[PDB]
Structure formats: structure tokens, C-alpha cells
């Protein structure tokens, strides 16, 4: 199985890329991010594996970066596989109230730090979390990196298909993609969860794909 990939994306923001054979297109590259406030690192989404979380973690730890915490876009393992480990390591793990009710609903270890509402600042003016509303998952959120004008749509931003409809609010995705396409259009880059990093246009295509997605069924 493909090795973890940590590629600087922009200033103080890396794109860790884990791979889990969720039998979709076989092996899938789950793109996450490690926002480096300054001397501190934040795992935006955690690899589906503790191992990779450990690797990603120490990769940054090893380079003098204290890991203040992780933040998950949604409850799936793509974004929570490491909360467990991160928790054993006493890493402040962050997930929405809705994701945790979902993690707890799935008997998965829940992130120790919750938060709710349309928006939550994980870091005053640097790591903004956001509930565009239901979409890929009922709890799915997106993390905006104001400073770099980078958004981590994660699995919400699905520009070429809606992907896993399993836990998706096909009826609410559009509304969400629009509330999203409306709040973060100032975006310089949008970070999907399985596609190359695109620009503010991904917010529109996700919308299109969502309505499109809805039109069918
Ligand atoms: Zn997902
Ligand atoms: Zn996904």
C-alpha cells in the first residue's frame, strides 16, 4: 500500500496524503492537511491509520513541531482514523458535536474536543472550521485557512462526482455547496479529499455536481 506523503502545499500548510484501499478506485489518496500555525502543527483530518497518524505526527514532531491538535472534517475514518491514537498520545482531538454523535453512534473513539454551530475557530484567525450544512455526510465540515485563503473542503468538495452517497444528504448538499460556494469564494485554493488541489472553481463544480447529483435522485 502507498506510503504516507507529506508535501508542502503553501506556506505553513502541508498536504499529508494517506491511502486506504476503501475499494473505491481501489487505493484512494486521502488528502489531509497539517496547518503549521508557527511552531505548532494541526492535523486537519487524520489518516485512516494510527500508523500514518504516528508517522505524520512524528514527521512534524521530529522537525520541531508540537502538535496542538487534530481536527476532523467528518466522522469517516478518512478523517478520524487517528483520533484514537492521537488520544493515546494526548493530542487534543477536535470534531464537530454532530461528528462525535456519529462517531459515538459508530462505536468509534470520539474526538475529545467538540464544538458546534455554523462555524468554529480552532485557532482565532487561522483555522476556521465550517458547517456548510449536510452534504457528503450529515456532520461534514470544511476548514478554512484565512491567512493563505485555502479551504480544505475535504470530502465535501467533490468536483467530478459526489463520491460516497452512503451518509450523504443528497437533498441538502446543494444548499450546502451554495452556502459554501458563497462563503469561501475568495478561496485561492480548495483542497478536495481525493483530487488534485484546485481553485475556487471547485466550490462551484461541487455545487453543480451536488444539484446535478440531486437532479438524478
Ligand atoms: Zn467521507
Ligand atoms: Zn472521502
From Swiss-Prot:
Location within or outside the cell: Periplasm
Organism of provenance: Serratia marcescens
Binding site for Zn(2+) 1: 74, 76, 136
Top-rank taxon: Bacteria
InterPro entries the record matches: Beta-lactamase_class-B_CS, Metallo-B-lactamas, NDM-1-like, RibonucZ/Hydroxyglut_hydro
Short name of any one Pfam family annotated for the protein: Lactamase_B
Residue numbers binding Zn(2+) 2: 78, 155, 194
Location (main, coarse): periplasm
The protein's enzyme class: hydrolase
Effect of residue 84 to G: No effect on catalytic activity against ampicillin, various cephalosporins, or imipenem. No effect on resistance to ampicillin, aztreonam, various cephalosporins, or imipenem, in JM83 E.coli strain
PROSITE patterns: BETA_LACTAMASE_B_1, BETA_LACTAMASE_B_2
Keywords: Antibiotic resistance, Hydrolase, Metal-binding, Periplasm, Signal, Zinc
Protein name: Metallo-beta-lactamase IMP-1
Cofactor: binding comment: Binds 2 Zn(2+) ions per subunit.
PANTHER family: ACYL-COENZYME A THIOESTERASE MBLAC2, METALLO-BETA-LACTAMASE DOMAIN-CONTAINING
Keyword Signal: yes
Annotated NCBIfam families: bla_class_B_core, bla_subclass_B1, blaDIM_SIM_IMP, blaIMP
GO molecular function, one term: beta-lactamase activity
Obligatory cofactor(s): Zn(2+)
Subunit structure: Monomer.
Binding site for a beta-lactam: 158, 164
GO BP, one annotated term: response to antibiotic
Amino acid at each position: 500500500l502507498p506510503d504516507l506523503k507529506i508535501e508542502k502545499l503553501d506556506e505553513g500548510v502541508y498536504v499529508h496524503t494517506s491511502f486506504e484501499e476503501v475499494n473505491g478506485w481501489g487505493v484512494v489518496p486521502k488528502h489531509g492537511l497539517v496547518v503549521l500555525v508557527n511552531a505548532e502543527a494541526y492535523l486537519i483530518d487524520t489518516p485512516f491509520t494510527a500508523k500514518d497518524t504516528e508517522k505524520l505526527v512524528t514527521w512534524f514532531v521530529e522537525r520541531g513541531y508540537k502538535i496542538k491538535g487534530s481536527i476532523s472534517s467528518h466522522f469517516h475514518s478518512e478523517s478520524t482514523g487517528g483520533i484514537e491514537w492521537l488520544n493515546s498520545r494526548s493530542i487534543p482531538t477536535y470534531a464537530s458535536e454532530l461528528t462525535n454523535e456519529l462517531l459515538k453512534k459508530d462505536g468509534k473513539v470520539q474526538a475529545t474536543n467538540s464544538f458546534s454551530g455554523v462555524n468554529y475557530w480552532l485557532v482565532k484567525n487561522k483555522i476556521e472550521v465550517f458547517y456548510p450544512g449536510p452534504g457528503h455526510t450529515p456532520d461534514n465540515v470544511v476548514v478554512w485557512l484565512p491567512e493563505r485563503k485555502i479551504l480544505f473542503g475535504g470530502c465535501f468538495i467533490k468536483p467530478y462526482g459526489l463520491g460516497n452517497l452512503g451518509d450523504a444528504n443528497i437533498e441538502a448538499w446543494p444548499k450546502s455547496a451554495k452556502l459554501l460556494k458563497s462563503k469561501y469564494g475568495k478561496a485561492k485554493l480548495v483542497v478536495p479529499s481525493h483530487s488534485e488541489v484546485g481553485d475556487a472553481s471547485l466550490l462551484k463544480l461541487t455545487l453543480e455536481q451536488a444539484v446535478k447529483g440531486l437532479n438524478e435522485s
